[PDB]
Design a protein around this ligand. Structure first.
Ligand SMILES: O=C(O)[C@@H](O)[C@@H](O)[C@H](O)[C@H](O)CO
Length: 300
């Protein structure tokens, strides 16, 4: 019937990735729930803008939605808790934290300090370090140039481990690797696949150094303009999308390693104890006082 608005939703994954399918599902559900009054347009591959630029856009009123996680720590320090190295044990553990009182505090700080509102969370597979030569322990890094996302805690940890990390937008990584500006990066298998890093990296080192969740978010200024009924529809659509997305994540766990191996990547077993000990020390040396007690709890 009527179409009142179109929400623009940007993310960094490609069209086969769980996040994209979930974003599309969110849009379908929201359209149904609002009789088409609210449409969603999904922009994959950072085509709407790079993550940090989208967060700024949401604050300014030019972007409606994005999928964002621990890069929010640049505004809301508690958001670093989404992705503390070696802190979370499993999907079930992260679900408990993200949905519990600590998760509520994180959500509220993101709303207040970043002016974006989490409406769903997606748990992720573990991040792994990719490289041009095998990296079996921190001692192998030896100053290796690598990319991290715009996450100060990751700069701190990877520098302490012996690498030379540089923050960069996700969509810049492939070309930077191709051109030899960096030799490695780190991400879950789903994103290594999404961005075709198999074409520019030889090794997946099984560091499994971060298990994290990420948020589907809406600009607080967009949320504020919605009627209570439409707010409810947004939440309902997001919950449906979250349930759907978890299934897609689980499917990806069964397939992505095999896929990447079929594209020539070599998976490398690491000295997990050495990585974990060095990374936990680095986290504790660099963690904000605000979240230190929670991190110590997780590490206990
Ligand atoms: O490497 C990346 O850019 C991605 O994995 C992001 O999802 C990243 O985790 C961001 O920091 C999330 O806010």
């Amino acid at each position: 019937s009527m179409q009142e608005m179109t929400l623009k939703l940007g993310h960094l994954a490609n069209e086969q990735n769980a996040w994209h399918l979930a974003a599309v599902k969110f849009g379908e559900e929201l359209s149904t729930l609002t009789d088409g009054r609210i449409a969603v347009e999904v922009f994959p591959n950072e085509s709407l803008g790079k993550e940090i630029d989208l967060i700024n856009g949401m604050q300014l009123g030019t972007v409606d939605m994005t999928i964002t996680g621990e890069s929010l720590q640049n505004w809301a320090p508690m958001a670093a808790l989404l992705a503390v190295p070696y802190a979370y044990k499993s999907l079930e553990h992260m679900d408990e934290v993200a949905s519990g009182e600590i998760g509520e505090q994180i959500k509220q700080q993101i709303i207040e300090k970043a002016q974006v509102r989490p409406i769903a969370f997606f748990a992720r597979g573990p991040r792994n370090l990719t490289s041009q030569r095998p990296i079996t322990s921190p001692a192998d890094l030896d100053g290796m140039k690598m990319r991290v996302p715009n996450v100060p805690l990751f700069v701190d940890v990877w520098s302490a481990l012996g690498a030379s990390p540089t923050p960069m937008a996700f969509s810049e990584v492939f070309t930077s690797l191709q051109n030899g500006v960096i030799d490695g990066q780190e991400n879950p298998l789903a994103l290594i696949r999404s961005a075709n890093f198999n074409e520019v990296q030889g090794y997946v080192n099984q560091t499994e150094h971060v298990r994290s969740w990420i948020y589907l978010t809406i600009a607080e200024s967009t949320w504020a303009k919605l009627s209570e009924d439409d707010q409810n529809a947004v939440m309902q659509a997001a919950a449906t999308a979250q349930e759907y997305e978890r299934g897609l994540l689980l499917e990806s766990l069964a397939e992505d390693r095999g896929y990447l191996e079929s594209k020539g990547m070599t998976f490398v077993e690491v000295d997990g104890a050495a990585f974990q000990a060095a990374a936990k020390d680095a986290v504790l040396a660099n963690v904000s006082e605000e979240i230190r007690p929670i991190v110590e709890s997780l590490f206990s």
